[PDB]
Amino acid sequence: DIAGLTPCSESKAYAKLEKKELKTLEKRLKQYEADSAPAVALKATMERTKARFANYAKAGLLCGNDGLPHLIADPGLALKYGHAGEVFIPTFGFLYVAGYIGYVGRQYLIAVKGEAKPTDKEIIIDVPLATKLAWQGAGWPLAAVQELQRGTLLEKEENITVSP
Amino acid sequence: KEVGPKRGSLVKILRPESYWFNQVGKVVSVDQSGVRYPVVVRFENQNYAGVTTNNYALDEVVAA
Amino acid sequence: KKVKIAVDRNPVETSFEKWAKPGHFSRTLSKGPNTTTWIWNLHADAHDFDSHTSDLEEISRKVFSAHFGQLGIIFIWLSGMYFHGARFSNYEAWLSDP
Amino acid sequence: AHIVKIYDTCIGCTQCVRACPLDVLEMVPWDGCKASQMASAPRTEDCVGCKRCETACPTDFLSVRVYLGSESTRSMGLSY
Amino acid sequence: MKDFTTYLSTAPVIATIWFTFTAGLLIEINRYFPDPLVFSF
Amino acid sequence: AWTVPTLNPDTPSPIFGGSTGGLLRKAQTEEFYVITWEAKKEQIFEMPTGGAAIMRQGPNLLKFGKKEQCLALTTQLRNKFKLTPCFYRVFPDGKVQYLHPADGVYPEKVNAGRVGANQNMRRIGQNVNPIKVKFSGRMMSPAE
Ligand code: CLA
Ligand code: CLA
Ligand SMILES: CC1=C(/C=C/C(C)=C/C=C/C(C)=C\C=C\C=C(C)\C=C\C=C(C)\C=C\C2=C(C)CCCC2(C)C)C(C)(C)CCC1
Ligand code: SF4
Ligand code: SF4
Secondary structure (H helix, E strand, O other): OOOEEOOOOHHHHHHHHHHHHHHHHHHOOOOOOOOOOHHHHHHHHHHHHHHHHHHHHHHHHOOOOOOOOOOOOOOOOOOOOOOOOOOHHHHHEEEEEEEEHHHHHHHHHHHHHHOOOOHHHHEOOOOOHHHHHHEEEEEEEEHHHHHHOOOOOOOOOOOHHHOO | OOOOOOOOOOOEEEOOOOOOOOOOOEEEEEOOOOOOOOOEEEOOOOOOOOOOOOEOOOOOEEOO | OOOOOOOOOOOOOOOHOOOOOOOOOOOOHHOOOOOOOHHHHHHHOOOOHHHHHHHHHHHHHHHHHHHHHHHHHHHHHHHHHHHHHHHHHOOOHHOOOO | OOOEEEOOOOOOOHHHHOOOOOOOOEEEEEEOOOOEEEOOOOOOOOOOOOOHHHHHHHOOOOOOEEEEEOOOOOOOOOOO | HHHHHHHHHHHHHHHHHHHHHHHHHHHHHHOOOOOOOOOOO | OOOOOOEEEEEEEEOOOOOOOOOOOOHHHOOOEEEEEEEOHHHHHHHOOOEEEEOOOEEEHHHHHOOHHHHHHHHHHHOOOOOOOEEEOOOOOOOOEEOOOOOOOOOOOOOOOOOOOOOOOOOHHHOOOOOOOOEEEOOOOOOO
């Protein structure tokens, strides 16, 4: 109960929706022989379904009046009430990989600018240079702040403009 | 004497209406006459018309 | 015989060397990119054989082997429909109650 | 009629005149380039404004320049 | 086969190998770790 | 030598069965444009109005409604056939006007004596702002 909400292990619409999905799977299962190949896949779907409900109720997700889990996207209401794995932990688990790709592509461009003709190594990617920059880009925030402290991250007004 | 940059020096364009403004190319020839735009610069960057070369004047030209 | 078989032995050498060079077919595209319009002109002018060369013999050879490529793709497609009808179907069941 | 002006960035490579589908343009003696020649627009009454001249100008920020003005029966390109 | 390896290093071939790699990595993850809505432990 | 040739309609037309792309009422009320060329041999050329005509040996005369049709015909006669055509301008009151090679020389070659109209002795980036040409009577470009 952060903003009119309720834990999903407490709310009854969540359990009613679990029983609704298991009821649809059960009346779907009632047509087949108990050991046939469709019935095995239907019971495996039931097992994945029940494991999904158990692990959404276990992590302390907040349900609403609809019986559906919600995501508190504010630190200080996620850190204080234990919901940092909703948004606040994957908002850095994403940005590590985002700045990773943005650093690997940056360094692949800068390490191919100073050649004979760079464009041929942009349609035909130099794979050993690409995999070297793929592995050694693991510490990208480190190298990014060390590049920002120089001023070698930005370029000055050598850039191309029109008519200011 | 030979006015302008040399035969193969890198150069920076100061013509604001050009496609290669603040952008670096190679001088390939400087015309030694009373031509308004003697400095011929070739670029790797082609423009929208697909052209990599242009004439420029002496005030629209600065080295490096 | 006016109507007779008439071919040319070994006209084009089988090599991956021109697979390394995109735009080998075109006189304008063979110089490489400087502009992202190049890579769209590569795929747009890829099968326009009449604009690559002016020799009608070479155009006819390209369009006669491209038809074998299309036929091989149709046989891959039909063979896949027969395979998916064999291994992943209820056709055995469907024949008893269609 | 359209307004067709040229500028002193002309290199005199006479490509606008060959590109012109209406003979608006012609090459005039001049002493500001190596080719000793510059274009001219004496016949802008016949111009339609199709801008083939400034698809053919090699100079960066085109030396020929068509300004779409009033439209007569020749500027609209009408056989009727 | 040096020309074949330069063909393998072109843009669409690297694109269709790397996208199958990053597809079939996430697909094996969502097989062995079903339904990750929230970062658990 | 060359001084402004005249026209007679006595010169024949190329053999052409007639298309629906010919002249309209603008030819009878406003103006129509006639083209002449001397051909060396009888050969087939594409009409700018659609269709193929065969030109005959000697002088030809063919009439159009646009200057672009006549200059397109000159463009394919000078390139494909290496002929030297010239077209005029005819008003319905009989007044004829010499239009193509004014000085005889085709306009892509310097004749050393034609006058340079509509030239700006300044760079196109050195145009004024449109605030400087505002209220010039009519609406007006800064290139003037
Ligand atoms: C931007 C919008 C957006 C967002 C935020 C999400 C978010 C999510 N979607 Mg969703 N989705 C979207 C758009 C979006 N989606 C769209 C447009 C579609 C339609 C195509 C879908 C279709 C869809 C389906 C069908 C499913 C999801 C699922 C999910 C969940 C992800 C679970 C997962 O795969 O964990 C991935 C977790 C990771 C930790 C992956 C990281 C990779 C590794 C571990 C890191 C690197 C390690 C190592 C260094 C790599 C080795 C490198 C190698 C070279 C050796 C998550 C809640 C799944 C789910 O459970 O739903 C809740 C699911 O089944 N989505
Ligand atoms: C027997 C069938 C046949 C054949 C052999 C050709 C052959 C040719 N056509 Mg032609 N054409 C055809 C049918 C055919 N066409 C049909 C049915 C149409 C009407 C749509 C056209 C319309 C057409 C036009 C308008 C033009 C051609 C052109 C060409 C030439 C070059 C084509 C090329 O390089 O494309 C290379 C291949 C591509 C560019 C890929 C196209 C991708 C399509 C449009 C997207 C749809 C794909 C898929 C079905 C959608 C799902 C995809 C999924 C990933 C979402 C070549 C001579 C061009 C030409 O001659 O230039 C002068 C040209 O301009 N054709
Ligand atoms: C906590 C959080 C939050 C909040 C947030 C915020 C509030 C933020 C802010 C932010 C900001 C205020 C920002 C700003 C910025 C600025 C700038 C300026 C930046 C920049 C960047 C850059 C520049 C980068 C670069 C790079 C790198 C380094 C990597 C990759 C590559 C590149 C190059 C791109 C939320 C709740 C939502 C969610 C959860 C989490
Ligand atoms: S518009 Fe451009 S092209 Fe058409 S006529 Fe006037 S100048 Fe020549
Ligand atoms: S504009 Fe371009 S083409 Fe026309 S004259 Fe000046 S340079 Fe030659």
